[PDB]
Amino acid sequence: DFALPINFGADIEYTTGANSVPFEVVTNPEQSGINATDTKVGKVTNQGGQYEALTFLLDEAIDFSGSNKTITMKVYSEVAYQVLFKLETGMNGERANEVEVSHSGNGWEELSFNFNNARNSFVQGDDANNGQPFVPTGQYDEISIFLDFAGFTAGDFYIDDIEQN
Numbered sequence: 001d002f003a004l005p006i007n008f009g010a011d012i013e014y015t016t017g018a019n020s021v022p023f024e025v026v027t028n029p030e031q032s033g034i035n036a037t038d039t040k041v042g043k044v045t046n047q048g049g050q051y052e053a054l055t056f057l058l059d060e061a062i063d064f065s066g067s068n069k070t071i072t073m074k075v076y077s078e079v080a081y082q083v084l085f086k087l088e089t090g091m092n093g094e095r096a097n098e099v100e101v102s103h104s105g106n107g108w109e110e111l112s113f114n115f116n117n118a119r120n121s122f123v124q125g126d127d128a129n130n131g132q133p134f135v136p137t138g139q140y141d142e143i144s145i146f147l148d149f150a151g152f153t154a155g156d157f158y159i160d161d162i163e164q165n
């Protein structure tokens with residue numbers, strides 16, 4: 001039931017990782033622009049940790065064996081920063097990989113993470129491969145969303161409609 005596509009507030013039994021930043025499903029406080037029909041959204045509370053992530057353990061792995069390698073997600077920010085969508089190590093040990101895009105800071109933005117242009121996630125002692133291009137082809141059950149990737153911005157942000165296409 002906690003599988004893509006994720007639209008929060010449908011009595012979703014979400015599962016977060018041990019080190020996840022606070023997350024909770026809240027009535028949409030910005031029923032505005034691109035997300036005006038959404039009545040419930042995900043409230044992400046950054047604490048100002050440099051690489052702090054919202055981490056979900058999915059009931060069903062995302063399958064990247066096909067040509068549908070693009071994850072889209074609505075994100076609300078009034079601050080311009082980088083957003084990272086990260087696949088942690090897959091079900092079969094598939095390499096952790098990520099796409100970094102910009103949020104222009106204009107409230108609700110549809111961000112597009114095309115894993116055709118993914119790179120190897122930082123792993124300690126893997127200098128040769130860290131940040132090298134990579135296209136996932138495997139099954140990934142653990143996803144990590146970084147608001148203000150590599151920055152220290154703290155505060156409440158909103159997230160909804162994580163989908164594969």
Ligand SMILES: OC[C@H]1O[C@@H](O[C@@H]2[C@@H](O)[C@H](O[C@@H]3[C@@H](O)[C@H](O)O[C@H](CO)[C@H]3O)O[C@H](CO)[C@H]2O)[C@H](O)[C@@H](O)[C@@H]1O
Nearest residue numbers: 017019020051052053055084086088098121122123144
């Ligand atoms: O990539 C440049 C930079 O990367 C740093 O490594 C971070 C990882 O530490 C981070 O790991 C996440 C945790 O910080 C978070 O709290 O939990 C989740 C899962 O439990 C982790 O994925 O992930 C990001 C993105 O892949 C990495 O960049 C290096 O430590 C640093 O030396 C390097 O400069």
